[PDB]
């Protein structure tokens, strides 16, 4: 259903749902909320699952917020030292600008 | 004193004693004696000469090694390499978690290739999307027989495949006759497609967009570029 909601070009319903299944635990699923979005709040939770400031940085940096991820990372006694490619490079783009719909509701006919 | 003896011990001996050494907790030293690929390997896990462990791996000769190792590498946060091993493993799932977290297209192409590999429909889609590629998502659907669903995407974010696709879906339906089951129209009648005139296509927004895809949305960030995708987005998008 969530998928239907993201298919369609509108934003909330998925988010409450996201709340209500985030709230029902998770280790690989948060992902669903993030892409079609920019911003995620999941990160507040996420760090707790990870909490190695690593995820928090990778995620963090672009809202102009790499920084908190570093603060903890330091506090720990950091453990990061090498990284692989991953520089945001894939397009979270597509959906439905004016003319030629969405489909909340879909019309048809027996004919 | 022992070292003089040491020449005068070989293969297997080294192993036993190595275990003793290991018991001594003279792991490094235990490393020096080290004498079985397994033996070396486990110790290596404990030990973490990372590169060194790789050489022992050499050609690992078991993804299981890589899997085990991957967890370890990741712990050491020796990712550049980890990626190489994991990639070498091509063990997609864990590897995805990293790759995604910083984000990356390149990973995505190779992966796309992978995506094709995996054998359940769903992941591959996220990828296609993730990349931004309706086209890919839709092509994927063609193989799986996702047909109702494919239509929704084709509609929402318009590649107007809704017209193309709908005919085919309908055809299936058609096969399974009954007029209601057949179901029919694209520009006008049942559907009024382009005559409805509403929210998944056009040039101007699109032009702005054309660029948009190219820059980073911005708010304040890192070398790891911007795109956003929230309230603002909704507003311009309408424009």
Numbering used by the authors:
A (entry chain A): 703 to 813
B (entry chain C): 605 to 843
Task: Give verbatim excerpts from the published study on this entry.
Coat protein 1 (COPI) coated vesicles function in retrograde trafficking between the Golgi apparatus and the Endoplasmic Reticulum (ER), and between the Golgi cisternae in both retrograde and anterograde directions. Coatomer (the COPI complex) is a heteroheptameric protein complex, consisting of α, β, β’, γ, δ, ε and ζ subunits. Arf1-GTP recruits the protein complex coatomer from the cytoplasm and anchors it at the membrane. Polymerization of coatomer at the membrane assembles the COPI coat, which recruits cargo molecules and membrane machinery to the assembly site.
The linkage structures are at lower resolution than that of the leaf, so we fitted our leaf structure as a rigid body to assess which subunits are close to one another in the linkages. Consistent with our previously published structures the central contacts in linkages I and IV are made by the αε-COP subunits, and those in linkage II are made by the δ-COP MHD. Interestingly neither ε-COP nor the δ-COP MHD are essential for COPI function and the combined deletion of both is not lethal for yeast. While the contacts formed by these proteins at the linkages may play a regulatory role, they are therefore not essential for COPI function. We found that βArf1 is close to the N-terminal β-propeller of β’-COP in a neighbouring triad, and approaches the trunk domain of β-COP. While the low-resolution of the linkage structures precludes more detailed interpretation, the proximity of the peripheral βArf1 molecule to neighbouring triads suggests that βArf1 could modulate inter-triad interactions.
